[PDB]
Structure 1
Amino acid sequence: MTKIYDAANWSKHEDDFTQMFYNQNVKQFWLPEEIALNGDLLTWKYLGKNEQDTYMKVLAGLTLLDTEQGNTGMPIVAEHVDGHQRKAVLNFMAMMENAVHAKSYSNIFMTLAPTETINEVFEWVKQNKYLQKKAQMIVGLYKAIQKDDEISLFKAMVASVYLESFLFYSGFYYPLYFYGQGKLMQSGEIINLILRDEAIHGVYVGLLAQEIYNKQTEEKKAELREFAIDLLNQLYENELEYTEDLYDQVGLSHDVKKFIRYNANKALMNLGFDPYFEEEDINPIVLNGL
């Protein structure tokens, strides 16, 4: 009467959520080529030199983050997470990062900017100290993951949630700010698709992190919260300097800072933690950008 036991298939749920994330991720599949970009040519031409500079640099910072999330972050987390369906979701998310998201920025650059300006902005990412610091910190945690060591994995998942749900947002602000004013709307459409993806990526990785956290003693949990909050504050302080560096020339630094604090709270919530920053009024233009 006994049966022969199941061989890792697709009808069997590994958990309560992976299948629905799998379906959501694959149904959200897109390519930048679906969006024609020549319609932004005039609203781009009309921006001040300061505005164009900030815009290029903002997207370049995003490109760097997605490059490392696709090359390193998502594949390494996929390697250490158990279960073929969980791995399939993480592999799909990894593909989106570098094959779709990172590439879309080049589609935008190639439309709006001459080659020399494109070359210069990629040189600028290499030498920018805030962008290098944030990459160093995030990638360092990814590369510190030890096989069968759930704590090192948790730390990298916190880093990934902070990249998905917090760090992208100093960059996302500006395309959204323009979209909300009816400017650069084709580029803005691409960015909204990227943002829609990152929101579900941050939730999913957050749920995996909570799984590991929930296995710990109360004492260990207290240390993990310390790690998460210390890391958030360290990233936050660096992001403030990055934000000022980019946005002071367009007069928006204070507004962007409010936006990144808002999203920091969302990252904490994705990790099952209470909000850390007090609520503030976000620019309604950016809210219309959503």
Structure 2
Amino acid sequence: GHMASIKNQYYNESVSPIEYAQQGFKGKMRSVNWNVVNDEKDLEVWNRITQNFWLPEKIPVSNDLTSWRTLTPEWQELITRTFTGLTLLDTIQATVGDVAQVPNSLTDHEQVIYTNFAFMVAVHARSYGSIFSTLCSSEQIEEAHEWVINTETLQERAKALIPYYVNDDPLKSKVAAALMPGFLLYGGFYLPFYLSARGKLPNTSDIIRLILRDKVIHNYYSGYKYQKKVAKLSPEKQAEMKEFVFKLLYELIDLEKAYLKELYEDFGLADDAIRFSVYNAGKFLQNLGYDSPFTEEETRIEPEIFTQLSARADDWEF
């Protein structure tokens, strides 16, 4: 014969504060448990993003003044406009998009990871201001803000993701949260890399690479959480979501092409920046578990640009 004979039961008996509110102020609230992490990926991502904390003071942007002064007023205007347009997209993501992901989290740890994302995107936006403080006149700064509000091709991109963040479909909101860091700013990042490949504004591109180090993780993590939810849904629902991802991406690509053509119209950069953008559209799809349909020609990046994009972002410490 033989003798006939559950840890952390409290967790199933309780709710996170967000869930308490979602349930109409009902339930026993649990503290986050950082000692028993439901998904190890959350702890990995928390560690990465917090260890990657930076502020723009880390970069000696004043060392870009010599090369900045070799640029014509038209190039300086292009840079200020491009960067103010990127600041707009970061403002959206920091104050609306990443915040909106907090209540749609699968785990308590993910809820606070998205507060880090929102804050770090605010740092991205603040970094462009630091660049402007160093390089630009007050007139250049103000004219770029005026141009941002009045440029419809830019506004249409800024408008495009906001309904998904405010409406009640958490999966579509998550797709938007991956598309912002994974795709929509790359046509603008083309510009500093084009310049730094030609010896102009090298320190600014170090800021861009610190921004990218964060954006890559934001895209990866939102895509990871998208897949975690979608994998449990019916085959019909999974196919519906794939169709939505491709539909929204293609719509964003069309808006991006129209904007970059206008933005770069005097400079000849739009065709190259569009290929750089579409290369990143393919990476975005891969981070959500899909195959890229784009051809080599549609995604071609010249070696000197790819070097700037790919270089590692690494005594001042935080």
What does the per-residue CA deviation read over 1:95-133, in whole Å, with 9 as the maximum and x for residues that have no partner? Answer: 1011x1110000111111111110110111111112211
Q: What amino acid maps onto 1:5 in structure 2? A: Q
Q: What amino acid maps onto 1:194 in structure 2? A: I
Q: What amino acid maps onto 2:41 in structure 1? A: F
TM-score, normalization by structure 2? 0.85
* 1:130 aligns with one of 153, 162, 182: 153
Aligned residues: 283
Distance 1:49 1:269 in 2: 40
Distance 1:97 1:2 in 2: 40
Which residue number in structure 2 is paired with residue 54 of structure 1?
78
**Which protein shows a greater Rg?**
2
Which residue number in structure 1 is paired with residue 124 of structure 2?
101
* 2:292 aligns with one of 260, 270, 275: 275
Higher mean alpha-carbon deviation, 197-206 vs 208-217, is at 208-217
Which residue number in structure 2 is paired with residue 246 of structure 1?
263
What does the per-residue CA deviation read over 1:162-212, in whole Å, with 9 as the maximum and x for residues that have no partner? Answer: 111110101111111222233211111111100111011100011111112
Which residue number in structure 1 is paired with residue 205 of structure 2?
188
Distance 1:58 1:276 in 2: 28
What does the per-residue CA deviation read over 1:265-289, in whole Å, with 9 as the maximum and x for residues that have no partner? Answer: 0011111111021123312221121
- Indicate if the aligned counterparts of 1:50 and 1:249 stay in contact, CA closer than 8 A: no
Distance 1:168 1:113 in 2: 21
Cα RMSD between the aligned structures? 1.6
Which residue number in structure 2 is paired with residue 38 of structure 1?
62
- Indicate if the aligned counterparts of 2:77 and 2:140 stay in contact, CA closer than 8 A: no
Which residue number in structure 2 is paired with residue 21 of structure 1?
45
Distance 1:282 1:62 in 2: 21
Percent of pairs with identical residues? 37
Question: Which consecutive residues of structure 2, in runs of 5 or more, have no partner in the other structure?
Answer: 12-31, 310-318
Q: Give the Å deviation of 1:227.
A: 1.0
Distance 2:224 2:164 in 1: 18
What does the per-residue CA deviation read over 1:43-91, in whole Å, with 9 as the maximum and x for residues that have no partner? Answer: 1111123322221111111100100100011111012214221112111
Q: Give the Å deviation of 1:36.
A: 2.1
Q: Where do 1:203-214 residues align within 5 Å?
A: 203-214=220-231
- Indicate if the aligned counterparts of 2:102 and 2:114 stay in contact, CA closer than 8 A: yes
Distance 2:270 2:7 in 1: 64
Call closer, same or farther: CA 1:39–1:257 in 2, change over 3 Å: same
Higher mean alpha-carbon deviation, 192-201 vs 217-226, is at 217-226
Higher mean alpha-carbon deviation, 42-51 vs 87-96, is at 42-51
- Indicate if the aligned counterparts of 1:125 and 1:131 stay in contact, CA closer than 8 A: yes
* 1:220 aligns with one of 237, 240, 258: 237
Which residue number in structure 1 is paired with residue 304 of structure 2?
285
Higher mean alpha-carbon deviation, 267-276 vs 210-219, is at 210-219
Of structures 1 and 2, the one scoring higher in RCO (CA 8 A, sep 6+) is 1
Q: Give the Å deviation of 1:248.
A: 2.4
Question: Which consecutive residues of structure 1, in runs of 5 or more, have no partner in the other structure?
Answer: 147-151
- Indicate if the aligned counterparts of 1:50 and 1:250 stay in contact, CA closer than 8 A: no
Distance 2:7 2:110 in 1: 26
TM-score, normalization by structure 1? 0.93
